[PDB]
């Protein structure tokens, strides 16, 4: 009796939850495009020590020479 005789206007006997009952791609047939089985370390060893050098790494839309192709120095 927290407030039974005290206050007769407070809720009880209420099942306000509203229940229910327990009642519970890879079309590779085509020949469209391949994939590669990821192995980050394999590709890491693939691109292992490419000493690419960026001498004059310029790719602007400048017009003053013949052509521009950076990422060119090697070992």
Site string for other proteins, 14-33 (x = CB under 8 A): --------------------
- The number of residues in the chain equals 75
| Sequence-ordered alpha helix ranges (H) in the chain | 40-46
Distance between CA atoms of residues 58 and 39, nearest Å: 33
User: By CB under 8 A, which span of 1-9, 23-31, 37-45, 64-72 interacts with other proteins?
Assistant: 64-72
Position among 50, 62, 63, 65 found at the interface with other proteins (CB under 8 A): 50
Point out which residues bind other proteins (CB under 8 A).
47, 50, 52, 59, 67-74
């Amino acid at each position: 009796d927290p407030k039974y005789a005290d206050l007769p206007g407070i809720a009880r006997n209420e099942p306000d939850v509203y229940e229910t009952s327990d009642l519970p791609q890879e079309e590779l047939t085509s020949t469209s495009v391949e994939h590669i089985i990821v192995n980050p370390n394999a590709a890491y060893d693939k691109f292992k020590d490419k000493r690419v050098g960026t001498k004059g790494l310029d790719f602007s839309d400048r017009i003053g020479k013949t052509k521009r192709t950076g990422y060119e120095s090697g070992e």
